[PDB]
Amino acid sequence: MYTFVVRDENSSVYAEVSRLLLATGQWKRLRKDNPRFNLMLGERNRLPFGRLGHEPGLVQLVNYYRGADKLCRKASLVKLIKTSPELSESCTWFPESYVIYPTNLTDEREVFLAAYNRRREGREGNVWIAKSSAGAGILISSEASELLDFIDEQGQVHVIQKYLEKPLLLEPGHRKFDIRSWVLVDHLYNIYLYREGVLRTSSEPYNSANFQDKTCHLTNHCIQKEYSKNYGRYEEGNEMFFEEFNQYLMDALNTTLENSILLQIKHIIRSCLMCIEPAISTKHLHYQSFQLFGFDFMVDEELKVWLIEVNGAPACAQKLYAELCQGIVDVAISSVFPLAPTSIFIKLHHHH
Amino acid sequence: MRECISIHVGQAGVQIGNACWELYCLEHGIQPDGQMPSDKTIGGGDDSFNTFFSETGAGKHVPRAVFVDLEPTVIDEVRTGTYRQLFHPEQLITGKEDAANNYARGHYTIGKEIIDLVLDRIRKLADQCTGLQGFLVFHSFGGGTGSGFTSLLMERLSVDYGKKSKLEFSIYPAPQVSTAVVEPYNSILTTHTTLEHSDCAFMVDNEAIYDICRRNLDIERPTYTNLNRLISQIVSSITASLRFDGALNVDLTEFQTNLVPYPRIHFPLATYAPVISAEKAYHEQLSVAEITNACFEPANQMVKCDPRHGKYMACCLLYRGDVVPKDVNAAIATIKTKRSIQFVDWCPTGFKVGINYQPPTVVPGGDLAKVQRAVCMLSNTTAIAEAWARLDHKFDLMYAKRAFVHWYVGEGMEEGEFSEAREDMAALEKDYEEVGVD
Amino acid sequence: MREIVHIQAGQCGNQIGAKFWEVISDEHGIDPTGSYHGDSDLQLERINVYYNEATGNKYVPRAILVDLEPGTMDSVRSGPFGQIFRPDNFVFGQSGAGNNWAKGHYTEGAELVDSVLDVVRKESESCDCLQGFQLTHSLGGGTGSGMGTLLISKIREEYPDRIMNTFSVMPSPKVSDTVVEPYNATLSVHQLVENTDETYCIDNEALYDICFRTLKLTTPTYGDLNHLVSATMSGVTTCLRFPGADLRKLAVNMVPFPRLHFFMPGFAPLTSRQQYRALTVPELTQQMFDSKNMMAACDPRHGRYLTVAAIFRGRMSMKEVDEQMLNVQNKNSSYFVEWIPNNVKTAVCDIPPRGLKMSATFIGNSTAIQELFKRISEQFTAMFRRKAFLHWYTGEGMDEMEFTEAESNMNDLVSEYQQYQD
Amino acid sequence: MEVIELNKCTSGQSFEVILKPPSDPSLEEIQKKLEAAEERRKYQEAELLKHLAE
Ligand SMILES: Nc1nc2c(ncn2[C@@H]2O[C@H](COP(=O)(O)OP(=O)(O)OP(=O)(O)O)[C@@H](O)[C@H]2O)c(=O)[nH]1
Ligand SMILES: Nc1ncnc2c1ncn2[C@@H]1O[C@H](COP(=O)(O)OP(=O)(O)CP(=O)(O)O)[C@@H](O)[C@H]1O
Ligand SMILES: Nc1nc2c(ncn2[C@@H]2O[C@H](COP(=O)(O)OP(=O)(O)O)[C@@H](O)[C@H]2O)c(=O)[nH]1
Ligand SMILES: [Ca+2]
Ligand SMILES: [Ca+2]
Ligand SMILES: [Ca+2]
Ligand SMILES: [Mg+2]
Ligand SMILES: [Mg+2]
Ligand SMILES: [Mg+2]
């Protein structure tokens, strides 16, 4: 009989995992403050890692990698890429980005303006996007004056990165989109990519001469369902799954989702996770960690894949909760606490 | 030459001290009768080993040590043990009934009645010193004597020897080798009243020593003898610089200078390697790089925690055996390119290195195998704050219900000393966070 | 040298105490004449904890036999090991206590108490460092209950800083001598709440049901019940009689609140006569934590453990002990308070009890003990609400108010257990 | 990667490596604490004895 605790009631994902665990009749849930547990579905912020692995005779497992925030934070991810030799400043699959602290608080203000003045002089597309981790607050603008003045009005660290002016546009619709990939890393640091992704599409025609109306530029599921007027026209809930998207790439571009996009996605997932492996691995630690990641990608009209951000506490698509959550119990939980296919994951081998 | 006086308080301090002086004797060639054939200056001498051993006219080499326990069963082992001839009666102090795992009983009730006697015996050893450096105080956190009486002794030592350094070797409580439930109380009470009196403290978590014994020595259920022999190896590596010719950590003041830029943050993390099982057929002798790399593996730390998620304030590498500086720097370079070693911006990113050519001595019949080289790393990481958090949390669980508090109030302690001590720890945990996180 | 002074008062107290010294005398190799004849030095290491060393290498128990009538102690003196007790340590009157707490506490008992304290004082003056006292008695009678708690009160006055422990047999209507037992038990419990550091609660109904259902004894006797108590007293005192600590250390770790110091003991194995079969460590652990093996007649699954101490005797796998113990906790953690970390402690002893390859004794401070005090309280109120049988007590100088206060003290104790059960 | 203060002797040597540069209560007061706790013990034992005298 295995014991687990729940310390994040807002996790749609692990709320289902907790539902599945109890359904096996072999897992018992305890109060959220009981230290005698096998598995912790920990909280998002300030998870007390230091208290794990000190209970005599209890192998303990937690669903978050201590230190993985370096990858799932806007400003941290930029710093990691620019300073990690494995990724280099010349990383080809990540948009040119800069960390910009507000003037009321290192900082890369002057470095951004130099590259900005170079684009402005060379007639090149000089459209950038500003964002932060404390948003629902995003601004897309072509003038550096507006971008910097928008951050000073705030008080949190922001990141300025190049805006992909040439995104791949689905048809009909002439509309933007992004791709969400779910990746599970287990206690052995095996990287498993869920075979099912989702394209969160924009139901509005992408307009390149008006960044003021952010309805056709931001493909977030909450924005399209609140500020867009064509929600659910082309695909239910602005969610196209790999089966449809793959068939589209064949009829239109005469290629497959695997060859044109998925190879790059798998390469990016590996590069990011292999990079921080020495810093977060729990291989020789007194407790074990696993974690579910949500990678967001962009695709340009050249079929080049760009990494947007990594989410450390991602939600799932309603249609894939069952398959994925079960997969979390199979490879991430029961692998350490066995019970009395054709995997739904794609293992990305690598050298540890 | 400047003398050092060792003080062992409670069962943990006495039994650990007994293991150390056993090791010290084997290291300096001292026999159980106190004789030292290699000491050509009979009945005198200011050699490095004389910092820990005085000498009689008859050639006996007597430890500069005092053993204190409020109950006599642990110290009676020394009076009739293998090295009984080393000590004389004045050095062994025992009461008639212990502190019952009750800090207040050790500090107040029983401490008040025996403190003057202990200081008197210490004064006698101090009178033999021509330039006393300070004291090394061994004790447990969880015991009523180890915690309660130690804090009182450290207060008086600061009064009777103002300009003298004091270092601790403190045993952090582990449930796997403890039958006491109130140890979180005692640990936090004794840390609170000892903080301003200790210049540098080496915490050893029994949980870590326990697992090293099971993992590396293949002891299914380790005993105190197994734990103490391993613990005395680490202690020996740390005090070796005071007992042998050298230039790094030559006196007690240099421990603070090299490991503690911030006074309250004076708990360095100790890591030791290699620990090889003697029962093994025959192990492949490890290189300088492999044993150095082992110092950044959590499994060989005296306190289990993750230095990858803290900041370093200092770092010493103490090598013993066949080690030349060329190999050390080569390994250091290899580790900086692989490990996450974050230093505080107001401290240099450096490593003070000491090499003693004499390899680690092992007690015949002990569990440790003879190795050609070994290292002990002393690093001041904010990661060791994890141990304070664990302890403070257990303190909060019981104190919220006032569980067991009446036992302490009944010995004359005020309840307010509980919260006063807990708030001092909450300030200590905050200091670590201010120094380590962004 | 941490000596303990043993006191046994009344019929039940002297018959159980007699068997106790019979059992441990065998374990320490002491024969009926006080002469040691064992084969292991472990037997003598802590022998002075309970025995005084007389001339000719004689070991005399540090025990004081007290009663208000001679009958029972004449039996002990004629019993198997009767010759081993110091003759001066027999202190008794002739009147009896008529199963009347008032007679033991106020009238008959008060006439005899001073002479008992003279013997206690004599035994203490010969102790290098006195740990404390242990008293065996019943709560349902008059001498052990009334005079026993009077003795405790006067022992705490003269030795305020010494530990006072008792083994207290609680009455049950299923194994009853008289109908006034709830009266006497309720009056004693308040004395114990105030003046003992640890009280092992032994319910005669649990002993009975164990002899009948588990041991398959068709017609149990007091002797059979005392067999269980003997074996349990030997188990709980193994911590003290062999190397591995003292009474005050035990109390410090077992009593989080001064008044909640009433323990449920347990023993394993409990085999009917399939008696030569080897008992594995898991079996020991499953039984030891099973209610059927507990002697307070309270279902631990009704409350929560504040603290638990377990002692394993014999040559077994200490590694396998930790595994099974941690298996019990980590499989029923809902019955352990989460605000006392690591409140389950385990100790091993290499010397097993006579006739057993290995055994386990269980010492639990459980809030389920409130069910025991609830039974007594309800039986008390059923009679006191009609003032039935009170004249036996008012005739000895007591007033109805003293009963009302005992009733309130009991219900307060129950309410105190109830608040910590949530 | 610099090596400074290399000191050598017969029994060993020591040196420093820099990888990167940077960026009480009196005796009287103790007696008061000790005697204060002893007084609270005396007061508690007096109340117990006063309780037993009643
Ligand atoms: N490493 C090690 N730990 C010990 C040893 N002896 C006791 N301990 C630990 O110390 C704690 C108990 O404190 P003790 O030192 O035994 O108690 P004390 O200092 O004698 O004080 P008293 O309560 O009066 O007995 C527990 O956590 C034990 O695990 C030992 O020999 N070696
Ligand atoms: N450099 C860039 N070029 C073009 N579009 C970009 C971009 N950066 C972000 N976007 C747009 O913003 C949307 C995602 O924004 P972002 O992910 O930074 O906010 P967010 O993190 O609060 C949503 P989530 O974390 O759930 O994916 C995508 O739909 C994408 O089209
Ligand atoms: N277990 C056990 N209980 C007893 C024994 N003798 C009496 N009792 C119980 O003790 C109570 C009677 O008290 P008793 O000791 O006979 O009165 P006393 O002699 O005046 O102290 C009743 O509840 C009996 O069931 C005995 O030998 N063993
Ligand atoms: Ca000399
Ligand atoms: Ca000082
Ligand atoms: Ca009379
Ligand atoms: Mg996000
Ligand atoms: Mg002790
Ligand atoms: Mg009777």
A128-132/A139-141 β-pairing: antiparallel
Q: How far is CA C365 from the centre of its chain?
A: 14
What phi, psi does B351 have (nearest 5°)? -135, 110
Is B145 annotated in a binding site? The answer is yes
Cβ neighbours around A303 below 10 Å, total: 14
Specify which residues C58 forms β-bridges with: C35, C54
Q: How far apart are CA B158 and CA D25, in angstroms?
A: 9
Looking at chain A, the number of H-run helices and the number of E-run strands are 10, 16
CB-based contact (8 Å) between C323 and chain A? yes
| B293 is known to lie in a ligand binding site | no
Residue C307 with chain B: CB contacts under 8 Å? 181
Q: Is the CB of A125 under 6 A from ligand 2?
A: no
In which domain, by residue range, is B437 found?
384-438
A330: its two tokens? 């199979």
- Write out the DSSP string of A121-154: HTT----EEEEESS----EEES-HHHHHHHHHTS
Cα–Cα distances (Å) from B87 to B32, B54, B126, C328, in that order, read 10, 11, 16, 47
A128-132 vs A198-205, strand pairing mode:
unpaired
How many Cα atoms sit within 13 Å of B200 on the Cβ side? 27
Q: How far is CA B13 from the centre of its chain?
A: 9
- In Å, what is the CA distance from A187 to each residue of A287, A334, A337, B66? 9, 11, 12, 49
**Cα distance between residue C19 and residue C84, in whole Å:** 12
Q: CATH: 3.40.50.11480, 3.20.20.105, 3.20.20.70, 3.30.420.40. Which one for A2-68?
A: 3.40.50.11480
Chain A residues in contact with C321 by the CB 8 A cut-off are none
Find out whether C249 and C307 touch, Cβ atoms under 8 Å: no
- CA separation for the pair C243, C31 (Å, rounded): 22
- Give the span between the Cα atoms of B21 and B16, in whole angstroms: 9
Are A181 and A172 within 8 A, CB to CB?
no
Residues B160 and B225 occupy one common structural domain: yes
Helix axes of C71-78 and C10-27: crossing angle, nearest 10 degrees: 20
> What sections of C237-364 are H helices per DSSP?
238-241, 247-254, 281-288, 318-329
d(CA A288, CA C268) in angstroms, rounded, equals 38
CA-to-CA separations, C288 to A52, A352, B176, C358, D10, in angstroms, rounded? 30, 48, 21, 12, 64
CB distance C322–B398 less than 8 Å?
no
- Transcribe A264-279 into DSSP letters: HHHHHHHHHHHHHHHH
Q: Provide the b/e sequence for C16-54 (b: ≥16 CB within 10 Å).
A: bbbbbbbbbbbbbbbeeebebeeeeebbbebbbbbbbee
d(CA B249, CA B252): 7
The DSSP secondary-structure symbol of A6 reads E
The alpha carbon of residue C28 and the mean position of all alpha carbons in its chain are separated, in whole angstroms, by 20
Residue C24 CA to residue C22 CA, distance in Å, equals 6
- The residue assigned the tokens 């192990």 is B283
Q: Using alpha carbons, list the distances in angstroms from residue C113 to A249, B202, C148.
A: 102, 56, 9
C357 touches chain D (CB under 8 A): no
Q: How many domains does chain B have?
A: 3
Report helix, strand or coil for B178: coil
Classify A69-69+168-348 by CATH class: alpha beta
Residue with tokens 């669903």: A63
CA nearest to A290, candidates A351, A337, A322 = A337
Asked if C158 is an interface residue toward chain D (Cβ–Cβ < 8 A), one would say: no
Ligand 1 first shell, C-beta below 6 A: B 10-12, 15-16, 69-70, 98-101, 106, 140, 142-146, 171, 173, 177-178, 180, 183, 206, 224, 227-228, 231
Is residue B230 a contact partner of residue B273, using CB atoms and an 8 Å limit? no
Residues 6+ apart with CB under 8 A from A84: A275
Residues 6+ positions from C364 with CB-CB distance below 8 Å: C263, C264, C265, C266, C294, C300, C305, C307, C308, C309
Question: What are the φ and ψ backbone dihedral angles of B135, each rounded to 5 degrees?
Answer: -135, 145
Closest CA to B363 of B3, B24, B9, B10: B24
> How far, in Å, from the CA of A331 to the mean position of ligand 5?
55
Beta-bridge mates of residue B271: B301, B377
φ, ψ at C419 (rounded to 5°) = -70, -35
**Residues with Cβ < 8 Å from A228, sequence gap 6 or more?**
A202, A203, A204, A215, A238
- Closest C-alpha among C258, C331, C330, C341 to residue C307: C341
Peptide bond into C70 cis (omega under 30): no
Residues 6+ apart with CB under 8 A from A15: A6, A9
Residue B84, burial from CB neighbour count under 10 angstroms (0-12, 13-18, 19+): middle
DSSP letter at C50 equals T
Q: Whose CA is nearest to atom 8 of ligand 3?
A: C12
Residue B60, Cβ neighbours under 10 Å: how many?
19
- 10 Å CB burial of residue B220 (0-12, 13-18, 19+) is exposed
**Sequence-separated (6 or more) residues with CB below 8 Å from residue C266:** C232, C288, C289, C293, C294, C295, C361, C362, C363, C364
Q: Pull the structure tokens for residue D33.
A: 């604490």
| All residues at 6 or more sequence positions from D15 whose CB lies less than 8 Å from its CB, including other chains | B325, B352, B353, D3, D4, D5, D6, D7
Helix ranges restricted to H, B267-319: 288-294
Residues 6+ apart with CB under 8 A from A258: A246
How far is residue A336's CA from residue A191's CA, in Å, rounded to a whole number? Answer: 16
Q: Are residues B312 and B223 part of one domain? A: no
The residue nearest atom 3 of ligand 3, judged by CA position, is C12
Whether residue A219 has its Cβ less than 6 Å from ligand 2: yes
Contact A257, A246 (CB under 8 A): yes
Q: By the 8 A CB rule, do B330 and B289 touch?
A: yes
CB contact under 8 Å between C257 and B403, yes or no, is yes
Q: Are A125 and A119 in contact (CB under 8 A)?
A: yes
Q: Are C321 and C349 in contact (CB under 8 A)?
A: no
Write the secondary structure of A84-95 as one string of H (helix), E (strand) and C (coil): CCCCCCCCCCCC
Q: What is the DSSP letter of A55?
A: S
Q: Which residue of C has its CA nearest to D49?
A: C157
Q: C221, exposed or middle or buried, with CB in 10 Å at 0-12, 13-18, 19+?
A: exposed
Measured from the Cα of C99, ligand 3's closest atom is 20
d(Cα A148, Cα B231) in Å, to the nearest integer?
58
For residues B318 and B390, state if they share a domain: no
CB contact under 8 A, B309 and A53: no
Q: Where are the beta strands (DSSP E) in B185-289?
A: 200-205, 269-273
C-alpha–C-alpha distance, residues B349 and D22, integer Å: 7
Strands A61-62 and B61-63: unpaired
- For C302, residues 6+ apart whose C-beta sits below 8 A from its C-beta are C368, C371
- Cα separation, A96 vs A192, whole angstroms: 28
Contact C150, C181 (CB under 8 A): no
Q: Look up residue A179 and give its amino acid.
A: I
Q: Are residues B186 and B311 in the same domain?
A: no
Q: Could you tell me where the DSSP H helices lie in chain A? A: 12-23, 69-72, 74-83, 109-121, 144-152, 221-227, 242-251, 257, 263-280, 321-328
Q: How far is C345 from chain A (nearest CA, A)?
A: 12
Residue numbers in B near A284 (CB within 8 A): 297-299
B69: Cβ contacts below 8 Å, ≥ 6 apart: B9, B10, B11, B14, B75, B93, B94, B95, B98, B145
Residue C249 CA to residue D5 CA, distance in Å, equals 53
CA A322–ligand 7 middle distance (angstroms) = 23
Using alpha carbons, list the distances in angstroms from residue B283 to A151, B295, B357.
61, 19, 21
To test the contact with chain C by mutation, choose from D48, D50, D54 the residue with the greatest count of C C-beta atoms within 10 A, namely D48
Rounded distance between C-alpha atoms, residue C43 and residue C29, angstroms: 7
Between CA B107 and CA B271 the distance in angstroms is 32
Which residues in chain B are closer than 8 Å to A53, comparing Cβ atoms? 304
C-beta A218 within 6 A of ligand 2: yes
Residues B352 and B420 in one domain: no
Please report, for chain C, the start and end positions of each structural domain, with discontinuous segments joined by +.
1-256, 257-368, 369-422
Q: Which two tokens stand for residue B391?
A: 């302890």
User: Taking Cα atoms as reference points, which of B225, B352, B272 lies closest to residue D17?
Assistant: B352
Peptide bond preceding A342 in cis form (omega within 30 of 0) = yes
Contact list, A48 vs chain B (CB under 8 Å)? 389, 393
Q: How does strand C358-366 pair with strand C305-314?
A: antiparallel
Q: Strands C262-268 and C198-203, how do they pair?
A: parallel
Q: Does D53 touch chain B (CB under 8 A)?
A: no
For residue A259, CA distances in Å to A263, A272, C138 come to: 6, 20, 86
Which of C334, C76, C300 shows the shortest CA–CA distance to C201?
A: C300
Block residue for tokens 């001679």: C70
CA distance C149 to C164: 11
Contacting chains of B (3 CB pairs or more, <8 Å) are A, C, D
3-state secondary structure of A197: coil
D5: alpha, beta or left? (left if phi > 0; alpha if psi -120 to 50): left
CA dist., res. A241 & res. A318, Å (int): 12
Find how far residue D24's CA is from the centre of its chain.
11
Q: What are phi and psi of A297, to 5 degrees?
A: -120, 155
Task: Report the DSSP beta bridge partners of residue A347.
Answer: A192
Best residue among A140, A170, A202, A220 to mutate for probing ligand 2, ranked by most atoms within 8 Å of CB: A220
Q: Is C355 left (phi over 0), alpha (psi -120 to 50) or beta?
A: left
Chain-chain contact of A57 with C323 (C-beta, under 8 angstroms): yes
Which DSSP helix (H) or strand (E) runs through B187? helix B183-194
CA distance B186 to B188: 6
Can you tell me the distance from the alpha carbon of B126 to that of C27, in angstroms, rounded to the nearest whole number? 50
* Dist CA B259 CA B269 (whole Å): 10
> Does B354 sit within 8 Å of D14, measured CB to CB?
yes
Listed by start position, the domains of chain A span: 2-68, 69-69+168-348
Nearest C-alpha neighbor of C213 from the set C201, C223, C205, C203: C205
Rounded to whole angstroms, the Cα distance separating B307 from A96 reads 32
Cβ atoms of residues C308 and C344 within 8 Å: yes
- Judging contacts by C-beta atoms under 8 Å, the chain A residues touching residue B207 are 54
What is the C-alpha to C-alpha distance for residues C296 and A146, in angstroms, rounded to an integer?
79
Which of B101, B400, B402 lies nearest to residue C252, judging by beta carbons?
B101
Amino acid at the residue A208:
S
Instruction: Using the structure block, give the residue that is written with the tokens 């709830």.
Output: C182
CA A14, CA A326: separation in Å to the nearest integer? 10
As a whole number of angstroms, the longest Cα–Cα distance in chain A is: 68
E strands of C162-210, at which residues? 163-170, 198-203
**Chains A+D touching (3+ CB pairs under 8 Å):** no
| Rounded alpha-carbon distances, angstroms, from residue C222 to C15, C204, C263, C292 | 9, 9, 22, 19
Dist CA C210 CA C224 (whole Å): 10
Which atom of ligand 1 lies closest to the CA of B106? 24
Q: Which residues' Cβ are closer than 6 Å to ligand 3?
A: C 10-12, 15-16, 97, 99, 138, 140-145, 169, 171, 175-177, 181, 204, 207, 222, 225-226, 229
Q: Is B218 on the interface with C (CB under 8 A)?
A: no
- Residues of B marked active site are found at 254
* Closest of B209, B115, B107 to residue B417, by C-alpha: B107
Nearest to C126 by CA among C56, C48, C66: C48
Do residues A58 and A38 lie in contact, with contact meaning Cβ atoms separated by under 8 Å? yes
Q: Which of ligand 3's atoms lies nearest the C-alpha of C225?
A: 1
Question: Which position has the token pair 């287990």?
Answer: A186
Do B330 and B432 fall within a single domain?
no
Determine the Cα–Cα distance for residues A156 and A153; give it in Å rounded to an integer.
Answer: 10
For ligand 6, the distance from its centroid to the CA atom of residue C182, given in whole angstroms, is 26
Neighbours of B287 (CB within 10 A): 16
Nearest to B20 by CA among B172, B193, B227: B227
Structure tokens at B36: 């030292």
Method of structure determination: X-ray
Compute the CA torsion angle A7, A10, A11, A12 (nearest 10 deg): 140
Rg (chain D; Cα; Å): 30
